[PDB]
Scaffold this active site. Structure first.
Site, PDB file in Angstrom:
ATOM      1  N   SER A 128       0.806  -1.214   0.000  1.00  0.00           N
ATOM      2  CA  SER A 128       0.000   0.000   0.000  1.00  0.00           C
ATOM      3  C   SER A 128       0.844   1.270   0.000  1.00  0.00           C
ATOM      4  O   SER A 128       1.704   1.471   0.857  1.00  0.00           O
ATOM      5  CB  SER A 128      -0.932   0.014   1.217  1.00  0.00           C
ATOM      6  OG  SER A 128      -2.008  -0.892   1.059  1.00  0.00           O
ATOM      7  N   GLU A 171      -4.350   6.417  -2.893  1.00  0.00           N
ATOM      8  CA  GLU A 171      -3.638   5.159  -2.788  1.00  0.00           C
ATOM      9  C   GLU A 171      -3.275   4.491  -4.125  1.00  0.00           C
ATOM     10  O   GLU A 171      -4.078   4.394  -5.058  1.00  0.00           O
ATOM     11  CB  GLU A 171      -4.452   4.186  -1.950  1.00  0.00           C
ATOM     12  CG  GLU A 171      -3.759   2.853  -1.797  1.00  0.00           C
ATOM     13  CD  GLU A 171      -4.386   1.977  -0.754  1.00  0.00           C
ATOM     14  OE1 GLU A 171      -5.381   2.383  -0.133  1.00  0.00           O
ATOM     15  OE2 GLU A 171      -3.855   0.886  -0.531  1.00  0.00           O
TER      16      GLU A 171
END
Ligand SMILES: NC(=O)C1=CN([C@@H]2O[C@H](COP(=O)(O)OP(=O)(O)OC[C@H]3O[C@@H](n4cnc5c(N)ncnc54)[C@H](O)[C@@H]3O)[C@@H](O)[C@H]2O)C=CC1
Ligand SMILES: Nc1nc2c(ncn2[C@@H]2O[C@H](COP(=O)(O)OP(=O)(O)OP(O)(O)=S)[C@@H](O)[C@H]2O)c(=O)[nH]1
Ligand SMILES: [Mg+2]
Lengths: 205, 177
Positions: A128, A171
């Site tokens: 991530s 993200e």
């Protein structure tokens, strides 16, 4: 030369350029991950990438890989992305008291450098990141990592409710089993808070 | 399922992350306690409705005031926290946290949370407090504060013992609907 997003306007501009036409199943796989990522990533690390242990995790992980493995699920250009980590990313023998009063433990920092700097690693969990340095956790954790992400890399960009339970994070999610090389591990001083932090430069490979 | 957003705020060290952790893991963190908690969608059911509530942990210290706003958009409810361990943190409810949250989350329901409920009858606490002519926040001071800042309601909990933890999040889900 890697694109760096200086602010919200840039992240958004870059953000619209990314593939977003996932199938319903593909969105649900991706969004499910954002809900809680411990279940995925901690399973993969514990079990080293084998999914045979848990039928449900197997289908859930297999699904997401497909979403992230789509031909169109790629980043067009070379981009710098960021994430923060707690000190135990470098091993259970470390906690967050490694920074005290904005002072990084030199001794501990050095044995961390000897052990990881220049190291090529393969990560079992997903990875991530944020395209915005100020987003995510890079400023709120003892270790910041900057990933230089190459053109062609498979990933998902997420910043809306259809894709993530946490929109506003800018993200970029990297597929599991990505290899990267830690090029440099160092200490830098925050321009503002005036505290020390461990910075990691890594290259996706 | 109704998706909702919850952001938790309060002075540094007043026990936000440990509240979030105990709430999910159901175990107090002793050695590997992070500054900010990982994303976590709590599934809570109140009055026949299931809610998926995204929890956002924040950094309480002044150094992070510039980054905290990034967490505030489209918030359904705020957990505003102080420690029962520290009146200093309560005084900071009206002085720092309500102004911030009002500006950024205008008219977003607020649940005032007194953390470290276990420390109220702690000799060590009572004693280190007495050095500053202070004492542990009394409940009616949290309530008083809760009414003064227009909170949905007022709760006290201890992550350490898990006392009242479940209740806090049931209430937040009620003010989120
Ligand atoms: N890290 C960041 O700044 C960003 C986080 N996110 C969000 O957070 C979630 C994933 O981020 P994390 O909180 O890092 O989840 P994670 O599962 O990657 O990390 C959980 C904890 O384990 C540690 N950890 C991670 N990888 C590890 C490894 N290979 N070995 C040992 N320890 C490791 C981390 O430092 C953290 O303390 C996603 O759901 C995403 O929504 C999104 C963008 C950037
Ligand atoms: N006695 C008692 N101590 C607690 C309790 N909850 C947290 N603590 C302790 O207080 C300290 C701070 O807790 P923590 O949850 O990290 O605060 P925080 O709000 O996350 O702090 P920050 O991220 O903004 S700097 C930790 O040492 C923790 O062990 C509690 O319920 N009872
Ligand atoms: Mg915290």
């Amino acid at each position: 030369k890697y694109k760096l997003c200086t602010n919200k306007e840039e992240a958004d501009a870059w953000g619209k350029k990314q593939f977003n036409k996932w199938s319903k199943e593909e969105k649900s796989a991706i969004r499910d991950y954002t809900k809680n990522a411990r279940p995925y990533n901690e399973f993969l690390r514990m079990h080293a990438g084998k999914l045979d242990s848990d039928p449900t995790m197997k289908k859930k992980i297999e699904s997401l890989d497909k979403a992230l493995n789509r031909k169109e699920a790629k980043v067009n250009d070379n981009i710098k992305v960021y994430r923060g980590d707690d000190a135990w990313i470098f091993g259970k023998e470390y906690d967050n008291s490694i920074i005290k009063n904005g002072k990084v433990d030199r001794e501990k920092f050095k044995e961390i450098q000897k052990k990881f700097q220049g190291k090529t690693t393969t990560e079992f969990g997903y990875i991530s990141t944020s395209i915005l340095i100020d987003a995510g956790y890079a400023k709120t954790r003892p270790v910041m990592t900057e990933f230089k992400v190459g053109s062609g890399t498979h990933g998902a960009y997420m910043n809306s409710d259809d894709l993530t339970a946490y929109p506003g994070q800018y993200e970029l999610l990297l597929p599991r089993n990505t290899v990267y090389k830690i090029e440099k591990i160092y200490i830098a001083i925050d321009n503002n808070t005036q505290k020390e932090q461990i910075k990691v430069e890594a290259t996706i490979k | 399922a109704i998706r909702k957003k919850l952001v938790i705020v309060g002075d540094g060290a007043c026990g936000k992350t440990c509240l979030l952790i105990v709430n999910s893991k159901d175990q107090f963190p002793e050695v590997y306690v992070p500054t900010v908690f990982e994303n976590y969608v709590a599934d809570i059911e109140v009055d026949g409705k299931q809610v998926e509530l995204a929890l956002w942990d924040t950094a309480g210290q002044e150094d992070y005031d510039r980054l905290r706003p990034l967490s505030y958009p489209d918030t359904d409810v705020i957990l505003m926290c102080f420690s029962i361990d520290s009146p200093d943190s309560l005084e900071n409810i009206p002085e720092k946290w309500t102004p911030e949250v009002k500006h950024f989350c205008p008219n977003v329901p607020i649940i005032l949370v007194g953390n470290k409920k276990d420390l109220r009858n702690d000799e060590h606490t009572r004693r280190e407090l007495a050095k500053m002519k202070q004492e542990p926040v009394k409940p009616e001071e949290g309530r008083d504060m809760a009414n003064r800042i227009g909170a949905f309601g007022y709760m006290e909990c201890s992550a350490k013992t898990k006392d009242g933890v479940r209740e806090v999040f049931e209430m937040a889900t009620r003010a989120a609907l």
